[PDB]
Amino acid sequence: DRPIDDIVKNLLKFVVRGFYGGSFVLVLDAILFHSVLAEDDLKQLLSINKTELGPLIARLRSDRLISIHKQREYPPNSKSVERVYYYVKYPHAIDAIKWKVHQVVQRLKDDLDKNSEPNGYMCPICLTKYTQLEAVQLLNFDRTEFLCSLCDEPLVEDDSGKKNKEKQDKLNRLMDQIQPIIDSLKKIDDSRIEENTFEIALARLIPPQNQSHAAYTYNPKKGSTM
Amino acid sequence: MFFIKDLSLNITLHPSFFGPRMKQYLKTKLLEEVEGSCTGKFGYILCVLDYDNIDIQRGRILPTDGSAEFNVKYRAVVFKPFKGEVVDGTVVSCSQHGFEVQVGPMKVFVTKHLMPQDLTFNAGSNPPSYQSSEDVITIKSRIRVKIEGCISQVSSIHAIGSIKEDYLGAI
Amino acid sequence: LKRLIEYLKTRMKVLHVISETPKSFLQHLKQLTFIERKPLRFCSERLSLLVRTLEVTEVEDFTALKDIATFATLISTYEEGFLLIIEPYEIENAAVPNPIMRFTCLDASIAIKPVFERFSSVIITSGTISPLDMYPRMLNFKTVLQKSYAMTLAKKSFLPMIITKGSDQVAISSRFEIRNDPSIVRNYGSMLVEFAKITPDGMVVFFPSYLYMESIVSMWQT
Amino acid sequence: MSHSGAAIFEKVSGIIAINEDVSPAELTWRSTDGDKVHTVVLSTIDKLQATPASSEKMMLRLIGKVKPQRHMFSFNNRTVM
Amino acid sequence: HNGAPHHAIEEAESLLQFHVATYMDNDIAGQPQALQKSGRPVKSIRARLKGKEGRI
Amino acid sequence: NKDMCPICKTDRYLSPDVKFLVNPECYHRICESCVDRIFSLGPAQCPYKGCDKILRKNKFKTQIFDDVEVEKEVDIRKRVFNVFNKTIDDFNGDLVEYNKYLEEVEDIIYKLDHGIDVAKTEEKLRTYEEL
Amino acid sequence: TINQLEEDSKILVLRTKKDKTPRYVWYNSGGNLKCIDEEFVKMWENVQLPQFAEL
Amino acid sequence: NTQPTIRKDGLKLVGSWKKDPELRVLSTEEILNIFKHISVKDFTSLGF
Ligand SMILES: [Zn+2]
Ligand SMILES: [Zn+2]
Ligand SMILES: [Zn+2]
Structure with a gap:
């Protein structure tokens, strides 16, 4: 259908294959294939456990990858269990992905900044850090070794600071692997993204099985001003 | 100052x-x-x-x-x-950690991470000092240091200096 | 030539329309890079000589290069009466910015001055040149005699008519911002249909702009 | 897009597709699980019955011509329907 | 982190809220109090502050 | 590359605040962030592969012409014409002498550009500016 | 066969935690499953994103 | 939006919306986000 929809599906697939485990890929591909899905639909298609989907749904909700809808309907047997519908909010998902990748690269830049300073001095008996600014006043009159205030122990040099090139190589290895994400968001930001919801995702659904316990038709109610 | x-x-x-x-x-x-x-x-x-x-x-x-x-x-x-103020001074003591330069009432420490790599420490010579391929830093010798940072207690102030900036060092 | 082209490319990147004199352009050019007016005034001749002496068989990728030489010879030789307009937008409806640079003739007399000084007597004659005295002011030359003849007719051969309102007495106009108004479309359409019903052989219809023509034809066809 | 859509026929899920390029055009309902495939020939269609937006359950009825055949279709979206 | 139903999350946050509240004030109307192993109520902050033998 | 800084690898879409900074000596594309990273501690060698010339942080600037070789040309022009400030009035109206002087200074600018005979031309420039 | 197709990034396999036993197979319509190193996966799972309105 | 009636149940707060009633438990992080959305003059008028 929409090439932009195929692009954002590729976004979701690549980010879940890169930064998430295989079961997360399975549930995300299930939601991407069948647009609206309930918990029994996932348990039928994937043969997944409730305790197995627990951490998966929790992590995908915390990362704003899967939107949950708390609508209950009225079946003919009237056993209206509170079924939850798992769908995707495409602008919310791409905003969450963009924010997460920007925060990862900013935190790595800050780690590179905090690695850019000189090594410092460690006290291994007390396991205490010492920067170059605060170790000035702990020297002896012998002018030989850094003596701790508590342990009175010969301080040792930190191995930090010399890992500046290692963190730079980590940045290089992150940045070229995330290059498809940047190239795809270049096309996304130059395009218009429609705000989808449960009703919009109902227009492009694929049936998961023959008999679904949860009805996909929206039931309006009077007095709801959420 | x-x-x-x-x-x-x-x-x-x-x-x-x-x-x-x-x-x-x-x-x-x-x-x-x-x-x-x-x-x-x-x-x-x-x-x-x-x-x-x-x-x-x-x-x-x-x-x-x-x-x-x-x-x-x-x-x-x-x-x-x-911090950010450049001051002259004289070195009063030296060690492989660096050297203490006296400016006024203050012993500013220039640490071994804050000089260019040409300067190396030696203890065999008397006094134990720093030497390079172009200049030496010994006791009671003129030098110029840039204050990278200072810490102020209630009754003590200690500053960290550097000579890595160009047009510094001995006059 | 290469650094002149790169200076022009640097002058392209702008967010607002810059209108400036050739002298200011040359002064800013000289301050930003060491290019004088004198080599610029011979740049086109030097480029022609260099292209001749190299005997290059294909010159199509040099063709736009000629434009630069033209620019290098225009804005350098003249300093009064011309302008340079740098626009970040060539057309307003484009999403992507497409900057353009227009070296512009403002004095219409500078091109026609060698004609009036070289030749001793010219006979300017147009069918519909009016008013007569506008042209000796707009073009710097003097006229020994000006007269516009009144054609003599036994019967009124041509019938000039002015239509200010439509059939329903609604005022009509061809201003560019009101080209989308349905009412003037109704008036022009009914007028053109009635005249086409009565015109014997053939019409010529003149519109003020081609974009206005496209809009009015699209609304007539819809 | 308009020619294909998820549907419920005889309380059985499936996909409605329009085989329009073939002569005559057909309405092919395909089972999601692969149980049964049924094609409706459009040369023997008498009446169509639709539901409005005010109806809660939205439902389509196809009445054929000669006992007339009745086909009874549930779509889950208003715009697709 | 390891995933739970919303009943379990609501129950855990209610238990945490109850623990914080009884740490701050054991005497809450309509609410059970925290009890010790010996069977006495937990002498909370409010009980240690209000009354005759409080701090004040 | 054209868009991304090859040292810190950061792209323009991710980091829109990066700026075009360049070394006047060896002319390598770099951003202001990397300049604040490596040369803030002190002078160092150029982080590109195959380049190790010494360069200073305060010497850094932005490329106006956006092309490397044209920046090379204009900066050699600035480096040469500061002391090569002769005009037609200095030659007392002699057009041919001024034309040959312009030809010679263009030739030495070209030689410092391509570096084919940089040694004697640099020595000539030093001896001229000493006067 | 499923094991060698899994490392080819052609199919997705659902395996038990007690032992690597293939039970259910889906089509891997996306890219490679090991495009990102494990330290960067930890870096991604450590970071957290703000709520809806702050973005 | 219509303001639901908020009442206390033990150590939690619940809210019932106006039926044109839907009663639901108000989460504490929602109240924290609402309080963060409160401007300076709003609680200055409230005396905070
Ligand atoms: Zn210790
Ligand atoms: Zn950089
Ligand atoms: Zn370099």
Whole structure:
């Protein structure tokens, strides 16, 4: 259908294959294939456990990858269990992905900044850090070794600071692997993204099985001003 | 660097010095704990100006000690360092960690991470010092240091210096 | 030539329309890079000589290069009466910015001055040149005699008519911002249909702009 | 897009597709699980019955011509229907 | 982190809220109090502050 | 590359605040962030592969012409014409002498550009600016 | 066969935690499953994103 | 939006919306986000 929809599906697939485990890929591909899905639909298609989907749904909700809808309907047997519908909010998902990748690269830049300073001095008996600014006043009159205030122990040099090139190589290895994400968001930001919801995702659904316990038709109610 | 400032000190004069000439005792006690005293608020207070008239207020008897708390307001020359200020100096001591350079009242430490790599430490020579392919740093030798940072306690101020910036070092 | 082209490319990147004199352009050019007016005034001749002496068989990728030489010879030789307009937008409806640089003739007399000084007597004649005295002011030359003849007719051969309102007495106009108004479309359409019903052989219809023509034809066809 | 859509026929899920390029055009309902495939020939269609937006359950009825055949279709979206 | 139903999350946050509240004030109307192993109520902050033998 | 800084690898879409900074000596594309990273501690060698010439942080600037070789040309022009400030009035109206002087200074600018005979031309420039 | 197709990034396999036993197979319509190193996966899972309105 | 009636249940707060009633438990993080959305003059008028 929409090439932009195929692009954002590729976004979701690549980010879940890169930064998430295989079961997360399975549930995300299930939601991407069948647009609206309930918990029994996932348990039928994937043969997944409730305790197995627990951490998966929790992590995908915390990362704003899967939107949950708390609508209950009225079946003919009237056993209206509170079924939850798992769908995707495409602008919310791409905003969450963009924010997460920007925060990862900013935190790595800050780690590179905090690695850019000189090594410092460690006290291994007390396991205490010492920067170059605060170790000035702990020297002896012998002018030989850094003596701790508590342990009175010969301080040792930190191995930090010399890992500046290692963190730079980590940045290089992150940045070229995330290059498809940047190239795809270049096309996304130059395009218009429609705000989808449960009703919009109902227009492009694929049936998961023959008999679904949860009805996909929206039931309006009077007095709801959420 | 050097400033001229207006300071106030709370001096706890003991009742044992409550003589008719108590102003002289108060002045001597003021200059005992001001000259050379280090304060993180105002830097190293070195000398006191305007000796002919020093504004001495009415001293407060403490509610449980009986001693008189005077608020003496004076004018003095101070040496407060700032990070980003370049100062000259002379090296007073050296070690493989780096060298202590004396600027005014302050022993600024230039650490082994803050000189260019040409300078190397040696302890076989007397005195144990730093030498490079173009210059040497020994005791009582002129040098110029940039203050990268200073830490100020209630009664001690220590600064960290560097010579990695160009047009620094020995003059 | 290469650094002149790169200076022009640097002058392209702008967010607002810059209108400036050739002298200001040359002064800013000289301050930003060491290019004088004198080599610019011979740049086109030097480029022609260099292309001739190299005997290059294909010159199509040099063709736009000629434009630069033209620019290098125009804005350098003249300093009064011309302008330079740098626009970040060539057309307003484009999403992507497409900057353009227009070296512009403002004095219409500078091109026609060698004609009036070289030749001793010219006979300017147009069918519909009016007013007569506008042209000796707009073009710097003097006229020994000006007269516009009144054609003599036994009967009124041509019938000039002015239509200010439509059939329903609604005012009509061809201003560019009101080209989307339905009412003037109704008036022009009914007028053109009635005249086409009565015109014997053939019409010529003149519109003020081609974009206005496209809009009015699209609304007539819809 | 308009020619294909998820549907419920005889309380059985499936996909409605329009085989329009073939002559005559057909309405092919395909089972999601692969149980049964049924094609409706459009040359023997008599009446169509639709539901409005005010109806809660939205439902389509196809009545054929000669006992007339009745086909009874549930779509889950208003715009697709 | 390891995933739970919303009943379990609501129950855990209610238990945490109850623990914080009884740490701050054991005497809450309409609410059970925290009890010790010996069977006495937990002497909370409010009980240690209000009354005759409080701090004040 | 054209868009991304090859040292810190950051792209323009991710980091829109990067700026075009360049070394006047060896002319390598770099951003202001990397300049604040590596040369803030002190002078160092150029982080590109195959380049190790010494360069200073305060010497850094932005490329106006956006092309490397044209920046090379204009900066050699600035480096040469500061002391090569002769005009037609200095030659007392002699057009041919000024034209040959312009030809010679263009030739030495070209030689410092391509570096084919940089040594004697640099020595000539130093001896001229000493006067 | 499923094991060698899994490392080819052709199919997705659902395996038990007690032992690597293939039970259910889906089509891997996306890219490679090991495009991102494990330290960067930890870096991604450590970071957290703000709520809806702050973005 | 219509303001639901908020009442206390033990150590939690619940809210019932106006039926044109839907009663639901108000989460604490929602109240924290609402309080963060409160401008300075709003609680200055409230005395905070
Ligand atoms: Zn220790
Ligand atoms: Zn960079
Ligand atoms: Zn370089």
